[PDB]
Design a protein around this ligand. Structure first.
Ligand SMILES: CCCCCCCCCCCCC/C=C\[C@H](O)[C@H](N)CO
Ligand code: NA
Ligand code: NA
Ligand code: NA
Ligand code: NA
Ligand code: NA
Lengths: 296, 244, 244, 49, 244
């Protein structure tokens, strides 16, 4: 009734065959007693790195070990323990006089790739899914706390970005906004995972649009819109110039973190936001160097 | 365990000096679940006509070679029926079986690191000083089947250490031990399907960590050939053929 | 069976061209029975600190080498914690795991006879004529870790034929076959314990029966290294450290 | 109550582990009938001194 | 499977680079049935004195050798007790175990086709033009133990293609793989017994299909030795010794 290669066919299997399983490991593995072993045929110490797998040799087979009941916790190395720590990811200036946002408002493009510490950590993984907690610390350039009322507004991509302090966009009929005084403790808020993808990508090896990819448009290489969450806008809630110069530091704490595919950790200094460019004339070694290989 | 045969489609690979097989992240390629999918149109699963071994260009290993790389969905977009489907369809999905082969003699020596780096984004030297925001050209980000040579292998041309590249599915070709590396990669992306033209899921890196060497008289031409086969290929969103 | 690993104490030996393991007289080292003992004081059994692999000096195999020998309790009396215990205690007892290693290439050739000769008493040439009752000096009867070279290997410097030395626990190192010899020796003496200073239970003989040979161009330096580990070491009769 | 490496320890074994046993041999061993053997895999004549 | 030992009579053959054993036409030599026989006299089955390995002359493989052949009942008719029985008796019957041996080194190369051709009738070049009905001399049809060299191996000196000689029990000696060929042949003829003098049941052909080659410096003398043993030998029709 039906061709055999179609019946016995396996095209369509949606379940991923996994060769490994995640086991409970709340503490470091214990060490078991070991005695001398003088025999042929069994060679724990000999490996073959070509295979691409790490050595499975254990302490017990290399030396005579005692019994150690290891009760050291492995909890502080979970993804949440590692990433759930607020760090600086943004900094906005609202000076009185200058060429940088001198009209009492600013539009910060949401991108946590502007600061090395936070950036290097997250770039340890290729993909990451998480909720976050944003905290906004505001004050003057001297650290002085001033009696000023500010308005922070999240402008998702597509919404109208304010063009002035008195822009109509500040009506926030739908965008989420926060009104705080610099005298109040830093505003804090919870953000969900808002990407149209299943996770954010710190690395996107491709282009966002089709067509010819000429020199002028190489600016778009590695730009993934699934990571472009919109803009963060700030302003003096008023219609006149503020009496003080302001600064807003943005901190981010990740929660409910999932991460996939680890990568080599940043080796060279960061230069730009949208890419991994490095100074070709100042390529420094990963670490420290010495005089001779036979001397410390 | 040193010998092996890989048969898929109408192609068969043989080897008598292998070093087992690596299955990237401990997962075999599979088709897309009905709950992981979004595109509502029924996909095409050409099977045998696209899931077979394609042998791309050969490279010459010199005592001074730095290394090469190939972006993957890409290397095949202009070859066989796989390429045609990748051009006619908007969405593509698939795993790969990569087999890098390179043989010498019991008197030659050297070691190649063969690794798979997902989302392998290329960076530039930034004009040397690091003040110029330059970007890699299309010819370098998506080199095609001819692959591309690394200018600064130590940092993988992306500011990251090659010494840690082993956290990725890899294998070595140590001439005194084996003459090939086999790595099976599942479909990895944050989406169930994606464009085979605009996006390159991963990159294949073949880099000499221990320089090739031999005494004058032994054959000096030592090639490195790349053979690869798609697995569980699925395409959707049919239209006219698009090259890029 | 060609590969092996010997782990004891905090030391491990590896080999990929072995020829099984010999257990002298079909007996494994063991501790002294309560009915075979006499000394009434409780002995010390330091275990891991003394029962481990000690690597003594290396010798160079030349196309004209005659052979060397090492007296055993002796070779270790001035090394590690074993030596300290051997010096502080009057009585000593133990077996040994001897691993002689020597590798070459598939183009070198030669055969070494590695044997254990209990109570290996050295004789002299008696002034050549045989009328002078001379005796071997302390430097020759107990050469220490540097071993001593044989002057007349045919008679083992003791008037006995080397051709019959195979009635003793032995093994050969034939370069085309293996690159090491492993012999396990139990404690052998007519007493349950004895002095590690005055008495040498046995001697290790490494003698080239088939001369080393190779063509000019192949590495000419072919070392022979001796590694040995005490087993079931027991000491008694504590006092101050005595060197001899 | 007591450290494990001490319980599982084998230091103290006074019995000598013998790999061989003495068997009765009042006379020389007999010879048994033998036929031709043309096969691969089994090589009695080949040794490794 | 690469190693083997063939013991028969008071002779033993050893090999460490064999390629299995071929049993001609899937049948082991056997004695004559009581219903397949005609001669009424009771035959002689000398066993161990005739069913053993006889080593015939050695040939030298040159870079220009064409090949040789041996007619079988014949090669042995003047050797050992087998020959005596073959001469004293009218009727003879037996199978054979043929072991062709030829070793070189891992740097030499070449391939010999070792085959058994039943009723190997020799033809002549017919005076070149093909108008002269000439016939092969006794020295060529039954060359004895010294064998005979082929003048036109392509046609096996009999107008038949050597490329098809593999439809006969055969084996190859590829120097990079094995150093010997073993073929066991049952008694093949249209009669239960026949004369060992007038009739040659089959011929052994050793022909270089892939020329021997090596670089100057490697030993140039590469011999090919033929060892063979009768099996299940039976003789009948006793009389005086006849040479031919
Ligand atoms: C007053 C309300 C303010 C609300 C602010 C909400 C901010 C939500 C930020 C989500 C940020 C996700 C960042 C993830 C990825 C990076 O943008 C990309 N890797 C940059 O290339
Ligand atoms: Na799946
Ligand atoms: Na490990
Ligand atoms: Na534990
Ligand atoms: Na406006
Ligand atoms: Na004992």
């Amino acid at each position: 009734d039906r061709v055999a290669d179609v019946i016995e066919s396996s095209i369509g299997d949606s379940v991923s065959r996994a060769l490994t399983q995640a086991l409970p490991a709340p503490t470091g593995q214990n060490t078991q007693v070991s005695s001398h072993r003088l025999d042929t045929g069994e060679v724990p110490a000999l490996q073959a790195a070509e295979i691409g797998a790490s050595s499975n040799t254990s302490d017990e087979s290399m030396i005579e070990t005692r019994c150690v009941l290891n009760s050291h916790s492995t909890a502080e190395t979970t993804l949440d323990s590692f990433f759930s720590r607020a760090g600086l990811v943004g900094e906005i200036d609202l000076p009185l006089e200058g060429t940088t946002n001198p009209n009492g408002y600013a539009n910060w493009d949401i991108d946590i790739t502007g600061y090395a510490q936070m950036r290097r950590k997250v770039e340890l993984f290729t993909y990451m899914r998480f909720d976050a907690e944003f905290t906004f610390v505001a004050c003057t350039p001297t650290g002085q706390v001033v009696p000023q009322l500010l308005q922070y507004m999240f402008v998702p991509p597509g919404a109208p970005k304010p063009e002035s302090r008195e822009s109509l966009a500040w009506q926030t009929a739908t965008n989420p906004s926060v009104f705080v005084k610099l005298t109040d403790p830093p505003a804090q808020v919870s953000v969900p995972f808002m990407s149209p993808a299943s996770a954010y990508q710190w690395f996107y090896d491709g282009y966002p649009t089709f067509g010819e990819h000429k020199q002028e448009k190489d600016l778009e290489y590695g730009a993934c819109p699934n990571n472009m969450m919109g803009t963060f806008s700030v302003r003096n809630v008023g219609s006149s110039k503020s009496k003080y110069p302001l600064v807003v530091r943005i901190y981010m704490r990740m929660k409910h973190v999932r991460a996939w595919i680890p990568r080599p950790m940043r080796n060279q200094n960061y230069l730009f936001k949208a890419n991994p460019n490095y100074a070709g004339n100042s390529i420094k070694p990963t670490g420290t160097s010495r005089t001779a290989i036979t001397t410390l | 365990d040193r010998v092996a045969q890989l048969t898929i489609g109408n192609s068969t690979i043989t080897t008598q000096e292998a070093a087992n097989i690596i299955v990237g992240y401990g997962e075999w390629p599979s088709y897309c679940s009905d709950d992981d999918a979004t595109a509502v149109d029924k996909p095409t699963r050409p099977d045998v006509s696209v899931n077979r071994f394609y042998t791309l260009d050969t490279k010459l290993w010199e005592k001074s070679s730095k290394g090469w790389y190939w972006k993957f969905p890409d290397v095949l977009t202009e070859t066989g029926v796989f390429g045609q489907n990748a051009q006619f369809h908007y969405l593509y999905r698939s795993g790969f079986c990569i087999h890098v082969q390179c043989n010498a003699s019991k008197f030659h020596q050297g070691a190649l690191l063969v690794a798979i780096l997902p989302e392998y984004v290329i960076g530039t030297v930034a004009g040397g000083t690091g003040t110029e925001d330059s970007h890699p050209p299309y010819k370098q980000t998506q080199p095609g089947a001819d692959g591309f040579e690394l200018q600064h292998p130590y940092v993988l041309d992306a500011g990251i250490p090659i010494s840690q590249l082993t956290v990725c599915p890899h294998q070595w070709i140590n001439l005194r031990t084996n003459n090939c590396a086999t790595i099976i990669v599942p479909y990895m992306n944050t989406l169930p399907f994606d464009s085979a033209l605009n996006h390159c899921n991963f990159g294949l890196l073949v880099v000499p960590i221990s320089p090739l060497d031999f005494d004058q008289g032994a054959t000096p031409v030592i090639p490195i050939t790349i053979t690869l086969a798609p697995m569980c290929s699925e395409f959707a969103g049919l239209r006219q053929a698009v090259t890029q």
